[PDB]
């Protein structure tokens, strides 16, 4: 017996939808849901989605509160919809998927993922929920996550990190590293060998290797000397060049984090969403050096060093394809006289 | 001669409604009030209330700009309406009360609190305003604050802190500690003996006793040893247990402040309002330990230690009622073999 | 061939309007522009202006992304409209000017500033764009900026700082110091000798002279002694008096920055816009000292010291006019027995 | 090259989307699309749909302007989507279908109905458009309309009337009677024998048989005598009983039309949509007789007489199923002593 | 002392703005203005304009309530703004002009039309208001209306009809026929010889000549015989051809009125505004004959006959220009063998 007043009762009393019985008085005005608390209206939810306010409130209340794959991973794996859960996209303040299965009467296309409407969609399945591994085996299209082995299914080890209530973390009290599986047209697909992005923030960036500790602590020329990166244009690509009106390089998150400690800068996130490669309109506050489209990726410095050192440096320009977060990321590699000039995630 | 243009003139020229004559051009679009300044529209107010935009703008302009009791105190005392002022609720960005008395023609139920419509309502009176002590004596229901003694009225010493323009502070240049008085059905009511919450923030938490300085500086086991808290489950209740998927304890603000210095965490304020006990959906970023409903109270550590040490520890589970901010707060006390297992502000 | 879908394509692919061909799917709901990215809506723009959402989105996409004069300078110079560009006002999240010339079909009053509709308006011209110096020579009213000399035109050296994508900075990789020129009724006007405001923030305030370094580092009495400021009421005007309910003085940004390091305080920006003098409703969190209208100016301490020391101190009260950012700023100077009592930017 | 400005140009110049090149200035405010005409804003469209305003404007501009099947017929035949057109639902002021095929980038699930996403959907095909009879030949699910014979397919003669720009009419200058074909999972279905509703209005009702002319002209008792309708409760079912507080019968549109000529009444259309049976909250203005749910069907009186005269009248109450507009309509038949008491389209 | 509350007081008590003192409580919600009447909100105004709700409410309250020229006339004469009045455009539910002079602080560009901002605008002047004939004497650009003679100026006799509170009428108790004067750049213009549109409605159409009485009463062939109209294609142009899918001719309002008496039809007013020629998407309900863009003009039948009989009929196709309502209306004239095939107001 689903209702707006029951969803609101669950939010007020349980912090989210918890299947509890009860009703609280609710008022909807414009895009906000309020509840009366001791004579006055208290805001429960502000709709930032393109769905109706009461519908978005219900999907947000029904969000998955266990560590789940980051939306960029689900997107890279072609996930269209989730089986009997809502993956909330905290970067967009919206449901990661348009439709639902067995969640909300307004957005449901089916009650169970076995319904024929779900067959052409890549349904996300969670092995931590009873019966979901079986539903994946029976699904025409799907993505499955598990905490352990599934008999006969060849796994793909996913990233160490997962999103728990919008906080990306490597779990200590909970498991965040999942086995990943995918099916296309009834056939289990071999997930490719891949690097993973580290999902760090600029302001609270922490190094995850001795090379990253050395990058943040050492001066530019001694880090390049220590790690034998001469001729690999780290001065441009990673450290960034702030000497001309157009900001040069600065494509690795660690390089932005290093710069941020010394001088602040504005990063305009003009397409705010979770993605393997992010595009920012950057303006350096100290110099005035800027770039409309600065592609930034958060790779572990060792992984980036491994990618660039593996490259043939004998051609002027070429596309270098690298699997990152299960997706093919195109990089533009520019060389001259056997040395790198630039290497960046190619702006489509 | 009240008007939208006159209220806006006062905001622009006086920083708030100050009874000054004058008009400025105003435009209202959706929920925002703008004023024309040198040919362009400048935002004066964004309506976050459930009242009409022009009405909410007037109540906000007419807000009390002197140190006033925090909304949680007024609510705990049963205050329905204020006499000839607006107590602005900065936690909700809205008037603390639905109706007004002698403030705004759209929200007024009366011009004076002596009107019979006010008799069944608990009217808030401010002894710092001429004639308000007399109006309280004549009111059927009411709450009065004063800076000094009222002849024959037995006072209740309120908290040291008050809210001045949304800033909770213990006044040095202004008085923030008031005497409190209450009347129910024409009869002056004895306010109970009470503890007070400290109204501190997580990010700018400052200790207000030697015990609080010792809690923040000493390690867990030496603080428990120094203050003889063995068998009182401070490891769980105050420090917090981040070892399991469900976050254990963590019900005192000081414990959250200590944790915040070392590791960050998300506190989802799912019912955003001022209250003695706050409920948060907490997610620890370091471990992934989380709790949908984590009740948090900001008591002075000495007061919490005094409350828990006063308890009989011979029963498995019982409700412990403690007067805090004039309200009865129920705590759930769980014991085993004469020692505390947990003690928390009981989730209703 | 201008279109909503083409503007959105440019934002998504180029970080702003860049004259590129292409279209992306767009949805408009209420005041927000979204684009479909892999099946889900992603927010591109939230309209905070009084213009229609699609119109404001286009003007924001078409904003000038080169270092431009800060809006306070343009306003002080009487600028009504810009020639073939949009000066985006980042303090208001809106176009600095109501109308456009050769920018957007909904806001354009003309395609070229030579059209007779532009003659009575003070058009902003940018010498860095080909043909704009010539358009200024032919304009009846206008303001021109250049990076160098214009034959026969007597220049005015503007501030060192300019706004680049909303970041106020003194350019190192780009030029931010412009020559300024103005015409009124076909006649080139002599711009007056002026001081410039420093455009600093409270939280990231940096001293720009040895006197400012000494103000932030030295104690009040030794700074006043070192710079011979006895009898100039710096204790009141610059340092601020937090001993009474009404906050005394505190009119220089550097004094607020010094106070902010020790004790936090709330600054209510009740008219949020760029201006030479700013008015704040200030509440000191430590003491509870407050002021509804506290005028604050960010002058270099040396310039303020030079202004106040140049004053005749023999009259009780008088208006002192000082040219700052090309505008006449009135200050109220109060003296007693040949010493300053107060000196503040006069509240109109 | 689809765009908001181009759609608006087509509406302004061609009365609808006509594939013409050009752009007009547009402004979007709340749910309304305006265009500038000689300096002032002129309303082009008001969004009454649940889609974004600019998306709904485009679908409405791209509506089919030829006589098309009434939405109730398409719904009764299970139509999910239309092939390369928009069937505009004038009763709801909205698109008849959620998604489109080759119409609008925001709503399109495919560009051609041959795409595999369309195979499980019942696609509407219009034989008047080149290649659509052939697209229905290879479609898995679909409904086809034609003006003539299709080789190899036996036709189902549809209603005489069609909707042309929201006007339901029997065409004289255009053909409105179509042949209907339907296929489910690649198999051409045998459409059932069906009656059709007449789709008339209460205020402009015209009789379409000699029996209907006699019903409107003759008195109740002489019409029942002429057509030998004694014992079939036409006094209750068709004429209506306005003698008690609850309005009795009145389930045939012709009976409402007859009553409307003499006395006015209110019909509250509480579910405003096109449907074979309509439900109204009726209040008779003359008597005050009313009914919350009065089911009304517009059958040709001869067809209703044939249905009621082809029923067994020996049971107290039973469900009578009748194919009307290709759907199964349940009627509740109530009898006593071999005579009808009531017969109405069953409220379920 | 202008105010929202004072404007509302005038609307409630005087039916419009009447300069009366007083205030009523007002609430603004979305685009609607309400007033409290005995405890409940009563709607005063719904904003259908692109201006802010409170601004549009004031301009509507301040509308001219005397018979004024129809907006189509003012537009055709190039009127930009009115002197100290608001011409309310009832066809658009909006002010006829963007800006005002001495009316509303939000829309005013000047207080008096003698201000230099008004010199390049064609200001509307009303000789019925004291001093306006004299203000037109010294205005650079303007249109003047008078009820009588102006010394030194030759008049242009305007239409018999004017708009009084949105009702177009030929005044009997008030004068609606004005003398028109116009000046461009200080020079009094010679207004051209012009026909006038009759501004009639389809449903309440009344003939204004013996020819119009004969058109409405006689059959098609005897009217054409009586007025010797053989070969002028009145059967197509005026009567309309409803025999093919595309509706033929039907460009004179009188022909639509004649058709409307016999058979109803839908006229979709896709550009709702006052104009000399109107464009409708017409659907004939009886036949299904339709036309996306059917240009309709309401000329007196005698005037249309004079125009068509004063043309050379020897060319296949040509543009015929006719001054109607002071503007040049282009007609497309199509001939064959010395006879008219069609003649219609040119869709451009
Ligand atoms: N072979 C199954 C089938 C045949 C058709 C079909 C459709 C149109 C004409 C003739 C045949 N549609 O499905
Ligand atoms: N001298 C040029 C001129 C004359 C007028 C004018 C206007 C009204 C009456 C008589 C003259 N308007 O412009």
CSV table of C-alpha atoms and ligand atoms in Angstrom, one decimal, chain E residues 133 136-139 144 150-153 183 186-188, ligand 2:
chain,number,residue,atom,x,y,z
E,133,UNK,CA,-1.9,68.0,-28.2
E,136,UNK,CA,2.7,66.2,-29.6
E,137,UNK,CA,3.6,69.8,-31.0
E,138,UNK,CA,7.1,69.6,-29.5
E,139,UNK,CA,7.6,65.8,-29.8
E,144,UNK,CA,-1.8,62.1,-31.9
E,150,UNK,CA,-6.2,70.9,-34.3
E,151,UNK,CA,-5.3,74.3,-35.6
E,152,UNK,CA,-2.5,74.2,-38.2
E,153,UNK,CA,-2.9,70.4,-38.7
E,183,UNK,CA,5.1,63.2,-37.1
E,186,UNK,CA,9.7,66.8,-36.2
E,187,UNK,CA,7.8,66.8,-39.5
E,188,UNK,CA,4.0,66.4,-39.5
F,2,LIG,N1,7.0,73.1,-36.8
F,2,LIG,C1,6.9,71.7,-37.0
F,2,LIG,C2,5.7,71.1,-36.3
F,2,LIG,C3,4.5,71.8,-36.1
F,2,LIG,C4,3.7,70.9,-35.3
F,2,LIG,C5,2.3,71.2,-34.9
F,2,LIG,C6,1.6,70.4,-34.0
F,2,LIG,C7,0.3,70.7,-33.6
F,2,LIG,C8,-0.3,71.9,-34.1
F,2,LIG,C9,0.4,72.7,-34.9
F,2,LIG,C10,1.7,72.4,-35.3
F,2,LIG,N2,4.4,69.8,-35.1
F,2,LIG,O1,5.6,70.0,-35.7
